Amino acid sequence: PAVRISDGNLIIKNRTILTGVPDNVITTSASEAGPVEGVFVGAVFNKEESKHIVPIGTLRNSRFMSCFRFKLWWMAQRMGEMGRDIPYETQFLLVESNKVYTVFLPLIEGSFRSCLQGNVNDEVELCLESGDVDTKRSSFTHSLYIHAGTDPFQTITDAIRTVKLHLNSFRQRHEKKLPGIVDYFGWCTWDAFYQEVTQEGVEAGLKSLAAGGTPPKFVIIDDGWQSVERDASPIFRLTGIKENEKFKKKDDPNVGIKNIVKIAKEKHGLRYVYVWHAITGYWGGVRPGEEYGSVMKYPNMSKGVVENDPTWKTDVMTLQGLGLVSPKKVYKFYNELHSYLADAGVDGVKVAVQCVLETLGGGLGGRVELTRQFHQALDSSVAKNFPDNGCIACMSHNTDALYCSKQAAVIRASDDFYPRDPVSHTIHIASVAYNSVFLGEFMQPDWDMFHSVHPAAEYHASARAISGGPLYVSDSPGKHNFELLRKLVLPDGSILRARLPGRPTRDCLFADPARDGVSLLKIWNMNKYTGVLGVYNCQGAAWSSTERKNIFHQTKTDSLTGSIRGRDVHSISEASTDPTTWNGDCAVYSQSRGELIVMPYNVSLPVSLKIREHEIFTVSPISHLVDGVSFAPIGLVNMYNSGGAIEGLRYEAEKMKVVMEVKGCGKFGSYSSVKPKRCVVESNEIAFEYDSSSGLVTFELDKMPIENKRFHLIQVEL
Ligand SMILES: OC[C@H]1O[C@@](CO)(O[C@H]2O[C@H](CO)[C@@H](O)[C@H](O)[C@H]2O)[C@@H](O)[C@@H]1O
Ligand SMILES: OC[C@@H]1O[C@@H](O)[C@@H](O)[C@@H](O)[C@H]1O
């Protein structure tokens, strides 16, 4: 039966994962389709309650990785071996058995949301909450799902699909439509002006970036554009749906945000303009009033949230409350805001402050209900007014929202980029990587803005390049490092986006690279015909379980040595043109060192990194045409994600020939065991270099493709 409870014990493929599973914990594998290869778990209690804690069993001697909410809004990672180490507000738990991997997915059921938490007895407790004292229940059958497999990533996906088939209240990442912003460079106003942003600042930032050769094709006009007011350090509330004075044209005050949209798009050649709002309008909601049925509500504190983030008790939102739009009028509110924005030429919204809803369900059916109602409405309005699916979810890491994520396709995957907080950089990289393991099953991760002139610029930039997600800076105008940005952005504003959410390697899933003092974090992704691997030292800082905030902590050495293997890129097979004959050998190109190495299957290459250093590798499967004649494309070697440039690849072994289609421009690189006879671009022979010791072939792709004809056609004649 595979996943089962027998005697006191949760058993997984003849391995005991939990002991002492109490009698009131019930399981079922029945479904709709029907017998399912894991188990839905619930329990029955004596009493009808709005909150229940129940032990699932005792976990000891089993390595795990967890994503837990360290703030209301956001998750980070914790590893361990003992149930006592499972944080409060654990929303995703992955367990390794010495090789089998078990996922634990705490779910929404009816009006209740679940999470996992550890106790001092090493039990894994299921915490069920409605978020409303009037919404009570005594039994549950589907509040947790457990599934096991031999591939850790496949095991997660398969369990999410099974959860999907049960709830039907969300779709998986790959089943949704990505907005077009994800293929272009962008700029966000946030760190440039904070709330002081003006239409003139927006223009100046766009102008300065395009001036250096790296033109953004989207912009996010961040927080500061909306009409907001304090009540008659006081919180601001939304007072109208239209822009404030800073975005009304300088002479004709009846033309509003449309002014800056036209300047962006018509004067500066941007494709997309997005704007920020809170899911409640502004931070203090909407000013009470009848138009949107807005009434003062005060955040309710839940124990697990406040245990991990005590400052949420005395947050400005908690003490001064929000004007919460009525459920009756929430569609009207979003439609009227969004119809105004779209008629002005706005293409999308970055919708922040998402999780507050879970704290405001008191009159209203609870956290799950209110969350669902507000997202149903938001989704109707976005699909109406922003039909490229122009929505970026922000501050949204609760399961209440994830399990109703039926449409939006991009999610901010960590706490904000913090230009002035030295502790935040290593932690940002670890958080985005680990969170993406789980968040990426729902939506494409967004690894946030960053600064091109900053001591950790390269660290952040290189991570964004391998993220799979949107690539955007928040530079103040004129504060740019164009040498860095050319590595990310082509002259037409396009980028070399990888295909998956960037994630830790199998190797790294259970070793905490922020806390263990021992390991390098390795992040893998895929292009069509290469893999890519980023390696990061992010030791020395993490969220402290004692101080309940991010701090520095002691590390044994400055420098650490780990190692790299082709097969660290978990799906590398899929880049091979002939994966049934491939022996697993890869060409491996270090983008910073400019070094090409051939790595046979399983051979390890040492990598040594000090804290806050990184290295990026393009990993390309070698094709063996005939004995002595081997090849692998690398791509645009002066860009971080070099392999992202390769759109087509055909080997013609009977002609000793390679045929590629390559986007972009700049220097193109490939591995060849032999010096080519001719490299031909667009039906003309060109000059090339060949290093005969490494096999590195090199030639220039001069200009972006003439037209419209979006790819360079390249033939390499061996
Ligand atoms: O700026 C206050 C506003 O930001 C949030 C998170 O977006 O809180 C951050 O700033 C607070 C004020 O100094 C801190 O107490 C808090 O821990 C930090 O996350 C919102 O909570 C808040 O309304
Ligand atoms: O008020 C500013 C905003 O809210 C944040 O916490 C964050 O996600 C920023 O990227 C941002 O737009």
From Swiss-Prot:
It holds the Pfam family Raffinose_syn. SUPFAM superfamilies: (Trans)glycosidases. It catalyses: alpha-D-galactosyl-(1->3)-1D-myo-inositol + sucrose = raffinose + myo-inositol. Its EC number is 2.4.1.82. Disulfide bonds: none annotated. One of its GO terms (molecular function) is galactinol-sucrose galactosyltransferase activity. It is an enzyme of class 2 (transferase). Induction: By oxidative stress and by dark treatment. Down-regulated by sucrose, but not by osmotic treatment. The keyword Glycosyltransferase applies. Keywords: Carbohydrate metabolism, Glycosyltransferase, Transferase. The keyword Ligase does not apply. Belongs to the glycosyl hydrolases 36 family. Transglycosidase operating by a ping-pong reaction mechanism. Involved in the synthesis of raffinose, a major soluble carbohydrate in seeds, roots and tubers. This is Probable galactinol--sucrose galactosyltransferase 6. The lineage of its organism: Eukaryota, Viridiplantae, Streptophyta, Embryophyta, Tracheophyta. The gene is RFS6.
